[PDB]
Amino acid sequence: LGKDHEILRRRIENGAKELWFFLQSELKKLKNLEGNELQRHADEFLLDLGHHERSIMTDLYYLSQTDGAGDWREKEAKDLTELVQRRITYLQNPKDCSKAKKLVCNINKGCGYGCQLHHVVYCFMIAYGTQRTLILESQNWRYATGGWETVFRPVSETCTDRSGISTGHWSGEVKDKNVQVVELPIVDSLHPRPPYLPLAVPEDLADRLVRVHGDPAVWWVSQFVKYLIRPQPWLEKEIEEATKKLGFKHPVIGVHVRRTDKVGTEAAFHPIEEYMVHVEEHFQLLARRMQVDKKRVYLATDDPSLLKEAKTKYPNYEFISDNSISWSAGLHNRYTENSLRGVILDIHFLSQADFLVCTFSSQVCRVAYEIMQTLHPDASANFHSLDDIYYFGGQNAHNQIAIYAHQPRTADEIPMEPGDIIGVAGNHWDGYSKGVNRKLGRTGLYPSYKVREKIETVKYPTYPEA
Amino acid sequence: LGKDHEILRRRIENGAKELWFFLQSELKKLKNLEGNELQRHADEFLLDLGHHERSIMTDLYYLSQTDGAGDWREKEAKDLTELVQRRITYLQNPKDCSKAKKLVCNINKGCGYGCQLHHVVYCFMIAYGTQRTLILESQNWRYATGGWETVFRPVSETCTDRSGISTGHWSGEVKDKNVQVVELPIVDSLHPRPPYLPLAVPEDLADRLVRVHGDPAVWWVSQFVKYLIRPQPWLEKEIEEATKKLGFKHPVIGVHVRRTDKVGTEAAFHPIEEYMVHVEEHFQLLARRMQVDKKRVYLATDDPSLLKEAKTKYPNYEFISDNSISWSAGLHNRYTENSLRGVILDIHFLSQADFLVCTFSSQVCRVAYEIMQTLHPDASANFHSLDDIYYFGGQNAHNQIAIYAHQPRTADEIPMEPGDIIGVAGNHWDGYSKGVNRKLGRTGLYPSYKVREKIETVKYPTYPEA
């Protein structure tokens, strides 16, 4: 038993004890206040609580690294990623391409870059589940009509040709067992749905994944994102060079302010301050554990006016941004190679930051977060997102299990019993989530701490030949 | 690296994260309320916060046990105490008692039983440090003119006689190096002071103790209490008998309400309710982890009126008490053998409880708390005390170290910089403590979480011969 482990655990315990003593002390005081004195005092309370909370959180972090837990998790995360990448590659490069089973995916989904990247990921996962080599057709890709190889390495070295002795539009893994080439539709109209979808992870990796990663769902998705966006030689140079021209050095917090056409239709408008509170709050967290010389925010946005506004409102922050990329993402010029390379770099630097603040309603941010999973052992927690929790457009039902019972205080809350299964609609980031208790078919709010994430598994192939 | 360990660590992180989301949300709501509506809501807040916090504490308890941490901690705590007991016994039992170095301690200090026991502990500790066998003179003991052996086995089987070729009153370990038998005075007039006092622990055990125990000072003191209170056969039988007759079964929470003469001069009067909140809060905690069939409180008091009052106010709690022991402790009849038997038994059952609630200003509670240390691996946190932090009457300076800087918000607070040394006067159990910042010599309040306990060591002998 390790001595730092025990000292840390004991300080995390006592930190909560003093936080609770303090909570009681100051709430009893607040009950007897009014007006300006109540607001002054409640605001000071929150300041003090913030620093308290950040000290507990910092101690928990150290606990996560002590006793070589840091070394081990990294080692084990590396071995897992190498294994899945070895299996994906093995699958993607059959010896005999004319005689290989194939899954044909077409990149031209009527949406944006991240929505399309995710369509190729969803295709890729099903190809991995069905043991079919992925044939990505990318001619006339609206962003770069040259095709996928304009920016990224092709998904296969040996098998890029979609030909075979029998081809058919998908109809089930059972029905298609002897169709050589299967054309796969977008998840929005897939029928029947195979088991090889998010957020389920492979049965065979699941135990190892839970030991290491806080959200094995995102980790599994990220494995295909990683392989896909393997970059062309010139793109690797463009990214490396742009890293130099921009002042991009860690410690940096990545921020994605998505506006333009998303507002109103798929997500809300959020002011810059709504993002920057988490940025400052999480620089404060970082500063408790390392030296923070200047507070750098990498700012990815499609509002070109934002950069000037942000710099004036936050004069202590160095803002790293490529405002001309921001202009390139405006709609009049959005679907062009110049813009595509723009969003690929913005997403890159987002994924590379130490922490991410954004809206998970955007496919752009979600990909940044997915790519982030591949650059650390467990980067599952590295975001204070503003609206949706994580999801994979097309996933199966996202379920939780209640672990503590809850009795509804108002009519807007649902009751929970331990074991009850709750499908979550979202987290409100106020201590409550919204969801349906499937047992009683009632929808409402429940205290977010009272549920446990239900990890789902699938019997995927294990490709032992790699 | 362990899987239950990692799931647990992440839920403590996530549970604390949701607690902060909740704290921010509901405090912002409170800022805009008035009077009765503010009070309704603030009280509901506190109710919810309690259960949130108790869930975090429960996961922290479980983390304390996973990966066999529990099993190992017990074994190591067992090995330590067996070693210290083997060393004390060796010292107390020379082969030639006529030629042994001896330290003469006199039990009849002008105070009560616990204060006298603690005087004998201080003598024992100094005798251990100087390698002198403890000769405990106890005739005319105010509690039992029969002597120490009225209740307890003698502190030595071979060496109980105080004779030697040179005897003298203490004058320092260096000056007395060749006086065979040294008479030790009460700590109140010990001069010079030797290094062998609380709250310092032996140099060689300090690393092993910190791996195991949350308050190594108490663990070291309890080691001597343990050796001291080995009871005579009738008393051992009396304890077993009273255990059956009172119906003492775990889960039981010990409560010690000290009143009579202690009020006004040495401590405050506290209503039964001030104790019973911590009792319920902690049965609520226990109930989160085990079955609580009946809520048992063991009640030690010198107020014989309390038992009837308590039973009436708390009709859900089974009160295990010996009201006549409460009567035997009354002022007019306190210093007799039957009374001494009362307090010894009251202290026994207190130490035996799953948790202790009391005033540490009373030596009676402190002795129970010290004895409690020898019945569990780390039982240092098993109290929600009502005034003083733990201390040993006569001790050296109790120092903490500031670990996070603090700037004083009002005039009652002291400033701290990390590394600053804080002499602690006590904890207010409201999130603040009182103390002196020695570097700048200022006295005041500081947030209790911003300090770290300063463990002090002393080079004690190691008695290789056992």
Ligand SMILES: *[C@@H]1O[C@H](CO)[C@@H](O[C@@H]2O[C@H](CO)[C@@H](O[C@@H]3O[C@H](CO[C@H]4O[C@H](CO)[C@@H](O)[C@H](O)[C@@H]4O[C@@H]4O[C@H](CO)[C@@H](O)[C@H](O)[C@H]4NC(C)=O)[C@@H](O)[C@H](O[C@H]4O[C@H](CO)[C@@H](O[C@@H]5O[C@H](CO)[C@@H](O)[C@H](O)[C@H]5NC(C)=O)[C@H](O)[C@@H]4O[C@@H]4O[C@H](CO)[C@@H](O)[C@H](O)[C@H]4NC(C)=O)[C@@H]3O)[C@H](O)[C@H]2NC(C)=O)[C@H](O)[C@H]1NC(C)=O
């Ligand atoms: C055409 O273009 C687009 C690309 O731009 C292509 O991409 C698709 O675009 C949409 C929009 O982004 C994506 O839909 C989103 O899905 C989110 C995930 O939903 C699934 O999982 C959820 C939890 O993680 C769970 O809540 C859902 O039940 C759902 O899970 C489904 O479950 C089934 C089993 O039960 C499975 O079999 C299904 O497969 C599975 N479904 C999916 C999608 O896989 C979802 O959370 C998100 O909803 C939020 O945002 C909605 C706005 O789009 C909002 O709608 C508003 O609702 C309110 C009241 O309900 C109403 O007053 C208002 O007027 C509505 N606004 C509009 C315009 O509809 C939702 O209510 C919901 O709100 C969120 O609520 C939570 C909790 O309160 C908050 O924490 C949060 O703040 C809040 N979010 C926001 C920002 O408002 C949304 O539906 C889709 O995933 C994506 N698809 C793909 C495949 O990538 C599209 O594919 C292109 N089409 C074609 C033909 O190619």
Ligand SMILES: *[C@@H]1O[C@H](CO)[C@@H](O[C@@H]2O[C@H](CO)[C@@H](O[C@@H]3O[C@H](CO[C@H]4O[C@H](CO)[C@@H](O)[C@H](O)[C@@H]4O[C@@H]4O[C@H](CO)[C@@H](O)[C@H](O)[C@H]4NC(C)=O)[C@@H](O)[C@H](O[C@H]4O[C@H](CO)[C@@H](O[C@@H]5O[C@H](CO)[C@@H](O)[C@H](O)[C@H]5NC(C)=O)[C@H](O)[C@@H]4O[C@@H]4O[C@H](CO)[C@@H](O)[C@H](O)[C@H]4NC(C)=O)[C@@H]3O)[C@H](O)[C@H]2NC(C)=O)[C@H](O)[C@H]1NC(C)=O
């Ligand atoms: C006669 O019989 C008695 C048996 O009872 C024998 O035993 C002695 O009994 C007394 C009282 O029962 C014990 O006194 C207590 O000492 C506690 C420890 O003091 C040491 O450690 C402190 C930090 O923990 C440190 O700050 C102290 O100065 C001291 O540390 C010293 O350090 C020195 C180096 O600088 C060393 O060289 C010394 O060796 C070492 N000294 C000692 C004493 O060991 C102490 O915590 C405790 O103080 C609290 O309780 C007081 C009441 O007893 C309370 O008094 C009030 O003071 C305010 C202003 O200060 C005054 O206006 C008011 O009138 C007083 N009110 C009352 C109720 O009387 C103190 O304020 C203090 O308050 C505590 O404050 C914190 C935070 O503010 C709260 O969390 C807490 O609730 C609160 N406590 C209470 C109960 O209110 C007390 O002084 C004594 O230790 C013990 N000595 C021994 C050696 O056994 C005695 O031996 C017999 N004598 C003879 C002739 O045989």
Ligand SMILES: Nc1nc2c(ncn2[C@@H]2O[C@H](COP(=O)(O)OP(=O)(O)O)[C@@H](O)[C@H]2O)c(=O)[nH]1
């Ligand atoms: N370079 C850049 N482009 C963006 C940004 N936000 C949106 N875009 C552009 O808008 C498209 C958004 O489409 P999509 O990937 O489907 O994400 P979503 O509409 O926000 O859910 C991206 O592919 C980019 O062309 C940004 O922050 N930086």
Ligand SMILES: Nc1nc2c(ncn2[C@@H]2O[C@H](COP(=O)(O)OP(=O)(O)O)[C@@H](O)[C@H]2O)c(=O)[nH]1
């Ligand atoms: N049996 C019994 N005796 C008590 C109790 N509380 C106080 N006394 C008596 O009062 C004495 C108080 O002396 P002491 O040990 O110095 O404790 P203190 O005065 O509270 O610090 C005890 O030793 C007992 O004689 C109690 O709960 N049970």
Ligand SMILES: [Cl-]
């Ligand atoms: Cl092959």
Ligand SMILES: [Cl-]
């Ligand atoms: Cl299928």
Ligand SMILES: [Cl-]
């Ligand atoms: Cl760097």
Ligand SMILES: [Cl-]
């Ligand atoms: Cl600023």
Ligand SMILES: [Cl-]
């Ligand atoms: Cl499960």
Ligand SMILES: [Cl-]
């Ligand atoms: Cl399956």
Ligand SMILES: [Cl-]
């Ligand atoms: Cl395990």
Ligand SMILES: [Cl-]
């Ligand atoms: Cl040992």
Ligand SMILES: [Cl-]
């Ligand atoms: Cl000897």
Ligand SMILES: [Cl-]
């Ligand atoms: Cl007397």
Ligand SMILES: [Cl-]
């Ligand atoms: Cl000395």
Ligand SMILES: [Cl-]
């Ligand atoms: Cl006997």
